[PDB]
């Protein structure tokens, strides 16, 4: 079985959430490959199939559980299991399609959505942009129930789409960015729910090119400034890796060092 990390929304604290996200990072990568002080995810090339995924088992107040599968090469959620049924996003390529057959192999009902697990498609399905989808412990609790009830026809597609958008941000994005982990910690500490601001959205949208820009630069300066946004939406440019080191927890493998 692939490694399993557990988290519950029942009595979640900033400490329990932090421990969770730290454990997710530690399973995503060994931390052996580090560029400009930022750990890199394992290279798809050379990654055996028995080390390809990690499982995040989520529980809530209702004691309902679902298990998300995460690809260690990019921290993307590729599918989930609830009871005796597993659902996978439409794979991006043939190799990924084959890889996911190694997931949840004892489940008797496997399904593949016609849509991939990217924000653009999910937002369309949900009928809402990330900017308008609240995040926090409450939202996660509700997302877990929605995922759990999908197999029994108790969950509408738009709600499923929304729920995925919530889980992805609070798990994957938080894993990728210390800044986003911090934002979720704050929501939790104060028992608040709220949509992510532009600073969060812009980071999520830039993870790929940030990874590239960092691994590309020899001494740590950027040939072309990276544009990001503050909470208030105002744009600001980033000329070197210093500011990014405390913001990014890990990068996707782009090139060799």
């Amino acid at each position: 079985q692939y490694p399993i990390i557990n988290f519950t929304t029942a009595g979640a604290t900033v400490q329990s959430y932090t421990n969770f996200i730290r454990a997710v990072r530690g399973r995503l990568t060994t931390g052996a490959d580090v560029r400009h002080e930022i750990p890199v995810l394992p290279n798809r090339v050379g990654l055996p199939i028995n080390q390809r995924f990690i499982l995040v088992e989520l529980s809530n107040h209702a004691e309902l559980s679902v298990t998300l599968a995460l690809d260690v090469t990019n921290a993307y959620v590729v599918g989930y299991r609830a009871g005796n049924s597993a659902y996978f996003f439409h794979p991006d390529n043939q190799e990924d399609a084959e890889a996911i057959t190694h997931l949840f192999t004892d489940v008797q009902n496997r399904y593949t959505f016609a849509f991939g697990g990217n924000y653009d498609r999910l937002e369309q399905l949900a009928g809402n942009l990330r900017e308008n989808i609240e995040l926090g412990n409450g939202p996660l609790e509700e997302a877990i129930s929605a995922l759990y009830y999908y197999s029994t026809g108790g969950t509408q597609l738009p709600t499923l789409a929304r729920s995925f958008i919530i889980c992805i941000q609070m798990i994957s994005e938080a894993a990728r960015f210390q800044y986003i982990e911090g934002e979720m910690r704050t929501r939790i500490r104060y028992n608040r729910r709220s949509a992510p601001d532009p600073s969060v959205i812009t980071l999520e949208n830039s993870w790929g090119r940030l990874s590239t820009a960092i691994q590309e630069s020899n001494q740590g300066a950027f040939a072309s400034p990276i544009q990001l946004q503050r909470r208030n939406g105002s744009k600001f440019s980033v000329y070197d890796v210093s500011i990014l080191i405390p913001i990014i927890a890990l990068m996707v493998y782009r090139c060799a060092p």
Epitope: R44, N74, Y76, D92, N93, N118, W207, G208, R209, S211, T212, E216, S224, V252, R254, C255
Partner: nanobody, 114 residues
């Protein structure tokens, strides 16, 4: 930024993907469908070399090309069928395989083809 621009059963179309701010020369570029169904990966891709990839279903019909000058990438779509109806979009990644894998460095909004 990547911006895309560009029919009766059997007709053709020419999709274009223009990059603003940077040059597509050093990027792996791929065209993709919003709903591939039973197939996976790009519709057609070009290496950052300059090999090209084509999905079996479009071989002999589609041709992808680069115009370094104007700094855009073209997708020629001949002998179109009803089943080709979909949203097509442009995605670029600087390193890795000829067909960009998520996460992309850059991608476009995509256009509809019926």
């Amino acid at each position: 930024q990547l911006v895309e621009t560009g029919v009766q059963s059997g007709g053709s179309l020419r999709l274009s993907c223009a990059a603003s701010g940077f040059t597509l020369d050093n990027y792996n570029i791929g065209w993709f469908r919003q709903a591939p169904g039973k197939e996976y990966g790009g519709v057609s891709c070009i290496s950052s070399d300059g090999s090209t990839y084509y999905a079996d279903s479009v071989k002999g019909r589609f041709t992808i090309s680069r115009d370094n000058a104007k700094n855009t990438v073209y997708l020629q779509m001949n002998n179109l069928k009803p089943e080709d109806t979909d949203v097509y979009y442009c995605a670029a990644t600087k390193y890795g395989s000829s067909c960009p894998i998520r996460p992309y460095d850059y991608w476009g909004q995509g256009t509809q083809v019926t």
